[PDB]
Amino acid sequence: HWGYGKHNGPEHWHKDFPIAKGERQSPVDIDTHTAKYDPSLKPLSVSYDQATSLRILNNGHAFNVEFDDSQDKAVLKGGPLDGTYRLIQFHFHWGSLDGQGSEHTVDKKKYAAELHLVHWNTKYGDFGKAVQQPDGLAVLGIFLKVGSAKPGLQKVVDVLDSIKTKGKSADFTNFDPRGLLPESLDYWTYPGSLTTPPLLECVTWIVLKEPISVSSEQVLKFRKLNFNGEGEPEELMVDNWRPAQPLKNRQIKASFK
Ligand SMILES: N/C(=N\S(N)(=O)=O)N1CCCC1
Ligand SMILES: [Zn+2]
């Protein structure tokens, strides 16, 4: 089944998921000189004050922090978006070393990791119906660089020892995702896809320009997770990123001059 190894990683995914070679795949390199400021972009709105986190899960690829999405409680609106998108989960992608780990790149620069806050368009009623639509999802992407610790990340770091292996989960109520955001909401946006199988082309990507800083110790704890299940030989969960894909017929727009 799919993964990030030499035998089942990004170069193999197209055999089971032919849209891997599609017209609107993610991630991409963001060429900052080619991106164009778009004055049509409405102000972006991240409204997370009522977020209700539930659980953290090691799914064998990354770890997901899941939210209650039964009601408009944590939502993304504005920017390139029409309507309202509800937060369902966040997760990260990261490297074995600090010089790689992000999925998107900025003028070919790779960051140490990348946070994805995944949201679905409430006009489609459920996440499963949203992923049958070209405007079903919005993913807010945030780069991580190593420097000072991110206080709002530490509760995530500290629970990882309890979800070391694939299939393990833990309660993760009362987590505030506002603590993962940088100061600025300046962003780039383009139409793309999920970056893991099934690679569905449903996503409006919103990638923040400002990275957050996390400490070396925080990212080192990500790298102690395991891809494998309990009782199986240890496979460190590192380098769970897809590289940049062809831009094809797309324009990346900037929210900032
Ligand atoms: N790959 C994904 N999100 S991402 N990496 O495109 O943000 N997902 C797969 C199922 C739900 C979200
Ligand atoms: Zn992701």
Side-chain angles (χ1 to χ4, degrees), residues 53-72 74-76 78-81 83-104:
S53 61
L54 295 165
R55 191 183 71 143
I56 189 170
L57 170 68
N58 178 332
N59 62 19
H61 309 293
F63 58 89
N64 292 346
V65 173
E66 300 163 355
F67 288 80
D68 172 4
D69 65 346
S70 59
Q71 266 172 67
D72 281 357
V75 301
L76 186 67
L81 305 172
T84 297
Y85 292 67
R86 283 198 188 150
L87 177 66
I88 180 165
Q89 54 112 311
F90 70 76
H91 63 270
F92 304 79
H93 305 260
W94 62 91
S96 54
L97 304 174
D98 292 351
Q100 64 185 38
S102 67
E103 295 206 309
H104 293 89

Side-chain angles (χ1 to χ4, degrees), residues 89 91 93 103 116 118 127 139 193-198 203 205:
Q89 54 112 311
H91 63 270
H93 305 260
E103 295 206 309
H116 290 159
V118 179
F127 178 89
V139 184
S193 74
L194 299 176
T195 70
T196 70
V203 181
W205 277 95

Side-chain angles (χ1 to χ4, degrees), residues 41 43-55:
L41 290 170
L44 190 72
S45 170
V46 180
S47 301
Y48 284 172
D49 67 315
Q50 298 287 305
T52 301
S53 61
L54 295 165
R55 191 183 71 143

Side-chain angles (χ1 to χ4, degrees), residues 2-5 7-39 41 43-72 74-76 78-81 83-154 156-203:
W2 68 268
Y4 292 97
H7 308 290
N8 63 2
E11 304 285 13
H12 287 276
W13 294 351
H14 71 102
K15 294 174 273 170
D16 274 336
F17 302 98
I19 200 173
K21 294 177 178 272
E23 292 302 300
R24 69 162 267 202
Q25 289 289 293
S26 296
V28 301
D29 182 56
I30 300 169
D31 174 338
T32 65
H33 293 108
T34 297
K36 193 185 182 183
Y37 169 62
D38 187 350
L41 290 170
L44 190 72
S45 170
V46 180
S47 301
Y48 284 172
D49 67 315
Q50 298 287 305
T52 301
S53 61
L54 295 165
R55 191 183 71 143
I56 189 170
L57 170 68
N58 178 332
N59 62 19
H61 309 293
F63 58 89
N64 292 346
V65 173
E66 300 163 355
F67 288 80
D68 172 4
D69 65 346
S70 59
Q71 266 172 67
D72 281 357
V75 301
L76 186 67
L81 305 172
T84 297
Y85 292 67
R86 283 198 188 150
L87 177 66
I88 180 165
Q89 54 112 311
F90 70 76
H91 63 270
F92 304 79
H93 305 260
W94 62 91
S96 54
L97 304 174
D98 292 351
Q100 64 185 38
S102 67
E103 295 206 309
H104 293 89
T105 55
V106 179
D107 298 328
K108 300 295 179 91
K109 176 189 177 69
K110 294 172 166 92
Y111 287 88
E114 187 173 330
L115 165 60
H116 290 159
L117 296 123
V118 179
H119 313 72
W120 57 272
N121 191 330
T122 62
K123 84 182 217 57
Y124 305 121
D126 69 59
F127 178 89
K129 287 282 190 289
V131 301
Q132 302 178 48
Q133 318 304 324
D135 61 349
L137 299 180
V139 184
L140 181 60
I142 305 180
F143 295 119
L144 280 61
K145 62 184 194 166
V146 174
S148 312
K150 189 68 167 180
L153 181 64
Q154 188 64 29
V156 173
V157 166
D158 279 340
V159 80
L160 297 184
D161 294 338
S162 76
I163 58 153
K164 183 176 177 192
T165 52
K166 179 182 178 137
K168 293 200 67 166
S169 59
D171 190 277
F172 205 70
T173 48
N174 305 289
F175 178 78
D176 187 346
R178 296 176 289 184
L180 299 173
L181 308 177
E183 291 177 359
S184 179
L185 296 176
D186 287 352
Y187 65 86
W188 296 283
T189 184
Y190 75 97
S193 74
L194 299 176
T195 70
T196 70
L199 301 169
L200 296 169
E201 289 180 341
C202 315
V203 181

Side-chain angles (χ1 to χ4, degrees), residues 228-239:
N228 55 281
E230 182 190 2
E232 302 168 1
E234 187 162 17
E235 291 175 73
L236 294 175
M237 184 178 279
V238 293
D239 293 319

